Amino acid sequence: TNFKFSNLLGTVYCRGNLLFSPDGTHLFSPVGNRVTVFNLVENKSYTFPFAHRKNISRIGLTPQGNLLLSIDEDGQAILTNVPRRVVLYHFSFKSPVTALAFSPSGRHFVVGLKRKIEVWHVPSTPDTNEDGDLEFAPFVRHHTHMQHFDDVRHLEWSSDSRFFLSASKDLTARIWSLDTEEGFVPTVLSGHRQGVVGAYFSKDQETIYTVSKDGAVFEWKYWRIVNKHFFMQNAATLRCAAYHAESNLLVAGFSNGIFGLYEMPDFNLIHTLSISQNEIDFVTINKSGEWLAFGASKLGQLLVWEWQSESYILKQQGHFDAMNSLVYSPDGQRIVTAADDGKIKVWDVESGFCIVTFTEHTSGVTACEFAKKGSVLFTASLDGSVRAWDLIRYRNFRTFTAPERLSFTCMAVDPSGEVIAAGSIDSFDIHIWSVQTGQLLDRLSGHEGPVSSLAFAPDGSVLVSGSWDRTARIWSIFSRTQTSEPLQLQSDVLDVAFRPDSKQIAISTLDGQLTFWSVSEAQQVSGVDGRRDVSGGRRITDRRTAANVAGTKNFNTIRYSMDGTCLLAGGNSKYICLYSTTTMVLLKKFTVSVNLSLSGTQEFLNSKLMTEAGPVGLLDDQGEASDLEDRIDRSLPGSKRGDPGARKKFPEVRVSGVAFSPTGNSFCAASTEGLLVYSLDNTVQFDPFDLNMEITPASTLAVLEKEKDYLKALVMAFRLNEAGLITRVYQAIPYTDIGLVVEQFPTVYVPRLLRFVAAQTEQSPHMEFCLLWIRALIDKHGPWLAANRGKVDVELRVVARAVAKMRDEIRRLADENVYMVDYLLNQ
């Protein structure tokens, strides 16, 4: 109904510098638009509210780690408040930002522009000044100096924040002040071979280290050089280096995926190992000195490394190709997504990590689904195969395929998961296997084109095929008459989705129109023409205008919500489109991406770009690169779906698949720039239910403390719908009076209460309290819940989620303790 933006998910890393918190337990990882922090000593991730226009170039942090300055390309700056996750200042450096170092005294920051070195005062924030607000132009500038010769790759401060030092792109480093010292002249650290990727201080600020690109690392004293020392490496050049000055150690990541780790008062190898086949982009290093963080920018490939207990505390990766499907477990706690990378991987909704990555397909995984159970992950791929994964044992039962070789593009499993349907583009019959046998049960007829959406009913009596014969089809398999019932449509069927009670079905068809059909007596009940609602216009290489492109004006994927009221709909476009079923009105619409290193974002793309060659973001500037594997264009001419070649500049904006969360209040878009979760935001927006003039928090707490009437206080606090008040009265009434209140409680606030005590069971430390609440609610409200059973089917299942993450998390421990002590007491 009212969905705001929750975490971006499904990409751990994109281009950009990454950083630790000063506590060491938060990792600040840039994804394309945004920055995800994930809490690493207690795994819980969050993405910030903001969203840049381009890809994140950099991030800096205040030493009191409360203030985060991010940079998108062409210098487009932000600084936000990390403890209270709010976005605070906008700024714009005019050059692109290629180096950024925030001062250790929390007072200045040096930015290194494309040759310019500008040192800025950090703005005082409303968290700092006493009676203060946002100023207008808060960034004031302390100095700027452009006495360099080429780009400035790195900036490293001192420890006492009075000198800083610049690692070039020309050949040199330079040592610089903040104010004029009396015996200091600002001076230049001389010749390397290629050009320095770092130049780091010690603790004692006499010897200065400097790390080039051609492997060599020099130690300078006072101003000549005390010892230059290289190290060998066969076919790679040194592309990142971080130096912890307290523990005296230098990491160095390379072009061939390897990093070396060197204790350096004198040159002395601690360790080295290889983590990617591709280059190492960014190295950051913990304040303790114990965790190293490496980002490899080509694939996802974020990893954190304990350098003395030689072990991956983190090694995570996104998808390096377009996704094709996501679903949720029926618990609702993990989303699985498949891609054209070949892997199908299992992501946890909390903690922001992939818990599994299955690599046993090759060549791109099309579809992905569960049964009723949530044990088995049935997936389908262009390898030609439907693999049925065992998700408790993390390995597959049974890989089915077709007798003649196919490449399946669609997949639907029965809810009682003993029947598989799949469907391809090469053949245009529909193949059905049996799971509890292993063979192929049938292949089914009827369609004059490649069947392009398959869906079983959640009853499991009816299969539904939607094909490019501009038709749909009711397949009544399970009885003695395996009969069909066609649905003559107007255009090529793109999608098919079921109402969660199986009495009504929706199809997307290639016009851009959705239509709604009765299933029992097959008959169209309704329909949307959504062609104008979905138009995310004017990709580049469109010489047509934004509103004339047919090709962004259709829905690839549709779902219903778990109530059965709103539909998600989405296509090869920028807008996710949230309709309803009864009144058919477009309820809500979401712009997926604000990005501008994506392609299909700006409709009405501006004419400053179009040079007299064409679009300036269409000129192949790959020869403007200083590395050979960057320069080599090993692409194949004219490949749309997955190729290893992949020039891959300005990818477009699609949603590759939406799905609703099985618990309420959330939303998934499998888009190109990640895997977005939208959530029904409830902690800022006041929304009462049926409220009167007297009912204040002073009135709820008044009948909570003065004259204790617990039913009137409970229905009162529900009737405000404020979480602090329902928590207050909830933890205020006693566990003797629970059965009184629920024994006389109104029937029409019951599923709100079931969702609340389910959340309090799963989150608050009040086991026997909340389980007494659930016991009273189901004991009194038994015939109501069993009689309705579909009106409340989401409320009963967020409860069954809570009383089975309690039944399995601590009573395995209670059983193992009581029988273990029974043994040790038996001797």
């Binding site: 007829s445 008459t481 395996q482 009969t483 069909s484 066609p486 003559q488 449509l489 107007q490 008959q523 169209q524 009940v525 309704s526 329909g527 023409d529 104008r532 058919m584």
Partner: protein, 126 residues
């Protein structure tokens, strides 16, 4: 520079064209008016889109229908399909887009055969 819409309709073999233009209420089927075509017992099935949609939707248009092929019944279904598609199509291109969707809702809530003709194939049972 006129407001013209061409529209077809189908049954077994009866095909019907209908041209709908900016007019003053008339519907003429093969020259003769609409209340004269299709022998008496099926003219209610001719009139079904008119008294679903209301004549106030039709008092600004002119519908000219040519019908060929088929028998009497199939010509009736071809005519009424051409009527319904004619007004939905004219309101698609010339008056606002909301009123199209409202007319599609009225016709589809009655019978979808006024808009999409579903010809019968056969059933070779398994």
């Amino acid at each position: 520079s006129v407001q013209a819409v061409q529209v077809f309709g189908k049954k077994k073999n009866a095909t019907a064209v209908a041209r709908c233009v900016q007019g003053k209420g008339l519907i003429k089927v093969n020259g003769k008016p609409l209340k004269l075509f299709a022998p008496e017992i099926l003219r209610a099935k001719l009139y079904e889109p008119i008294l679903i949609l209301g004549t106030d939707k039709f008092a600004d248009v002119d519908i000219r229908i040519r019908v060929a092929g088929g028998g009497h019944t199939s010509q009736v279904y071809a005519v009424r399909q051409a009527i319904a598609k004619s007004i939905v199509a004219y309101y698609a291109k010339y008056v606002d887009e909301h009123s199209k969707n409202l007319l599609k809702q009225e016709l589809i809530q009655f019978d979808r055969s006024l808009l999409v003709a579903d010809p019968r194939r056969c059933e070779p049972k398994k």
